[PDB]
């Protein structure tokens, strides 16, 4: 009822097993027993697979496991017990798993990790996941006893009732800590215990409206934390300020993210200049996605944000209904080098103010993909204010046909026009371009002379002929999949003098001797075509249809 391959990888997934299947062997290296109905696991059910390296028992209905059930799994490296029905954990289970690297106990209705440390012998553990939405309510100092270093630690404690002080402090290093907290009640206690270990902190679903700061024990060395992210949090202008005060403890913080967050209240907070945080330390990257401001009304004093983003080099604000970056605000971002405003509401009329005379002085890369831009001509003219812009992405914008004449930033060498619905390319596009992406459009041909072009992306278009080499005397890379070419003679191939990489795959070809002879004569061009011959299937005739070369 189960099938294994030649590498000892056996599939017993989505079966109706009510117990571990019999006749397992020492030749088995991987076992997938997910989506089953194994209510009970006995002492010898898994004794035969002494060489098992991977054990997935995800989504079964496991409610009982004998203490010594894993006695012979000394070679096990991966144990996934997520989404099961284990309401109690036994330290006996993990004792013989000295080689264990990944352990998932998340999604089980247990209230605690037990009265006995579960992991003191998992010396090789790198990843640990625990907790649940409804019942996990307490963290004790012994819970994580024995762990020195972890790459990823995820703790779901949305229903946490008590955290024993110094519990998280025993872990020396944690590259990525994910915390699911519904309230901010224990945030300060937890934070204090992770200043020396966590390199990347992620907070999910936390309501921080009631959060209030208070001085933490200043300690010996600096925090190794480089990234801090908030996911699904709720903030107020007041509480947001309180959070910033934590920055004094993570002086090496370089990146901050706010994803799917909500900012409530009106827009007035009016504090003294002392409770206001105006410094952002060494943070150079700020990333915001799907931010909801349900009452963007009473808000009026943007300057606190001016000192916050003063020394910031990278900013991302995705899918957050942005329609305007005020000129005066744009002029204050003197250090900004990268700005991403994808999936917003930018239109030329508002963009003219955002990229006003003096806006984003140091900007090098600007991404305006999937906005409401309609005109390439007016847009290039508007962006002329950006003297250092070198890369522009205006993909996923519905542009009207382009004209013969256009003005663009003098240093612009990269341009993304993917998915703009264009049918023709005209001299609007500057010859200063080194990289051009015009994929996923409606082009029937390409006749634009670009003397400096090194890379052209034009996949998913309607070209029936690879474009003339003379249009690109120095092209290095060309990707033209999902188009409409069918032949590719040696002449045109050798025509590009500097060409290195070509992607003609996933196309519809005609299968003729006049071509096949060329295929056999020089397979030395297999080092110019990627995904060859995987994606180079034929179409005609019906005999060779869907057959590789």
């Amino acid at each position: 009822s189960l099938s294994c391959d030649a590498s000892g990888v056996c599939d017993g997934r989505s079966r109706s097993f009510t117990s571990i299947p019999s006749g397992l062997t020492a030749a088995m290296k991987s076992l997938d027993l997910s989506f089953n109905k194994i209510t009970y696991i006995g002492h010898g059910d898994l004794r035969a697979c002494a060489n098992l390296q991977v054990l997935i028992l995800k989504s079964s209905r496991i409610n009982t496991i004998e203490g010594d059930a894993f006695y012979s799994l000394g070679s096990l490296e991966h144990l996934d017990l997520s989404d099961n029905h284990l309401s109690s954990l036994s330290s006996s289970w993990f004792g013989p798993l000295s080689s264990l690297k990944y352990l998932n106990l998340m999604g089980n209705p247990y209230q605690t990790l037990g009265v006995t440390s579960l992991f003191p012998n998992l010396t090789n553990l790198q990843t640990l996941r625990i907790g649940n939405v409804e019942t996990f309510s307490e963290i004790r100092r012994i819970d994580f006893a024995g762990l020195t270093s972890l790459n990823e630690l995820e703790i779901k404690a949305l229903s946490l009732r008590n955290y024993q002080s110094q519990s998280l402090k025993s872990i020396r290093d944690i590259h990525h800590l994910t915390l699911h907290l519904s309230e901010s009640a224990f945030l300060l206690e937890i934070f204090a215990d992770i200043l020396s270990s966590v390199r990347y902190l992620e907070l999910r679903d936390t309501n921080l409206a009631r959060f209030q700061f208070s001085p933490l024990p200043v300690d010996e060395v600096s925090s190794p934390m480089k990234k801090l992210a908030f996911r699904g949090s709720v903030l107020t202008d007041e509480s947001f300020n309180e959070l910033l005060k934590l920055l004094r403890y993570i002086l090496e913080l370089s990146e901050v993210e706010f994803d799917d967050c909500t900012l409530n209240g009106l827009g007035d907070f009016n504090p003294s200049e002392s409770d206001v945080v105006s410094e952002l330390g060494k943070v150079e990257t700020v990333t915001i996605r799907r931010l909801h401001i349900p009452q963007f009304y009473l808000f009026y004093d943007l300057s606190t944000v001016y000192s916050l983003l003063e020394k910031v080099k990278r900013i991302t604000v995705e899918n957050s209904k942005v329609f305007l970056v005020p000129c005066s605000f744009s002029q204050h971002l003197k250090s900004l080098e990268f700005l991403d405003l994808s999936e917003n509401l930018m239109v030329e009329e508002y963009l003219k103010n955002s990229a006003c005379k003096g806006a984003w002085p140091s900007l090098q890369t600007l991404v305006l993909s999937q906005n409401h831009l309609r005109s390439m001509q007016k847009t290039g003219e508007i962006l002329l204010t950006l003297k250092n812009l070198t890369s522009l992405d205006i993909s996923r914008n519905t542009f009207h046909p382009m004209p013969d004449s256009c003005q663009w930033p003098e240093k612009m060498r990269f341009l993304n026009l993917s998915s703009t619905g264009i049918r023709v390319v005209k001299t609007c596009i500057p010859q200063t371009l080194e990289v051009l992406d015009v994929s996923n459009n409606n082009l029937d041909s390409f006749s634009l002379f670009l003397p400096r072009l090194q890379e052209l992306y034009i996949s998913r278009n309607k070209l029936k002929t690879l474009p003339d080499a003379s249009l690109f005397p120095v092209l290095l890379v060309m990707k033209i999949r999902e188009n409409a070419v069918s032949t590719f003679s040696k002449d045109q191939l050798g025509s590009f003098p500097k060409l290195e990489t070509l992607e003609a795959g996933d196309n519809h070809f005609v299968c003729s001797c006049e071509l096949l002879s060329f295929t056999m004569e020089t397979p030395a061009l297999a080092q110019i075509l990627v995904d060859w011959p995987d994606s180079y299937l034929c179409d005609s005739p019906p005999r060779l249809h869907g057959h590789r070369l």
């Binding site: 004093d301 943007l302 300057s303 005066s328 508002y350 103010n353």
Partner: protein, 190 residues
């Protein structure tokens, strides 16, 4: 008795040129125009002829004369009317300001000064407010006396009149006139 007028017409005023005006989600009964010359988002109510005048916008190259006041919506940065088109050319158009005052002891005095017009298009809001303040500071308007008129005389006859015993009607603050067509100004305080 004239304490309210003196308080209002001694408020600080703000003026900004070449501003970018925009409209938001109309959250209350009266639409607002927003400008951010620096770091403050200013909300300016659209009343009177401005309701017809401004639609979805955006509106570039506007000047604003702003006076901040107590209001219902509890906004902290709110002025009313006073929106005009910015100068196309620089203007220094000097006009005569005459001031007649009949004091508490029936004595009639007449004084004169010059008033510098610097805008091609100027709001009644701006003229009313600045002139009354000048009259308050220098001629004790709303001290013992708080009646009479300000009259803006245009070169081709027309008049714009501000009655001093009460605040300027709200809708007229959006009313704009040709700054370069003002001939003179006559004040009569009594």
């Amino acid at each position: 008795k004239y304490e309210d007028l003196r308080a209002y017409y001694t408020k600080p005023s703000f003026e900004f040129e070449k501003q970018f005006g925009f409209m938001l989600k109309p959250w209350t009964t009266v639409r607002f125009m927003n400008v951010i010359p620096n770091r403050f988002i200013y909300k300016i109510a659209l009343v009177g002829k401005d309701e017809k005048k401004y639609k979805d916008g955006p509106y570039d190259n506007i000047d604003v004369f702003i006076v901040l006041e107590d209001n219902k919506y509890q906004l902290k940065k709110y002025s009313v009317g006073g929106i005009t088109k910015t100068n196309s050319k620089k203007v220094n158009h000097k006009v005569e300001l005459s001031i007649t005052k009949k004091d508490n002891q029936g004595m009639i005095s007449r004084d004169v000064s010059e008033y510098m017009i610097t805008k091609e298009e100027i709001s009644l809001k701006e003229l009313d407010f600045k002139l009354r303040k000048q009259l308050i500071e220098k001629h004790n308007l709303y001290g013992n006396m708080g009646s009479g008129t300000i009259v803006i005389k245009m070169k081709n006859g027309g008049k714009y009149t501000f009655e001093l015993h009460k605040k300027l009607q709200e809708h007229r603050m959006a009313d704009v006139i040709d700054g370069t067509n003002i001939d003179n100004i006559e004040v009569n305080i009594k």
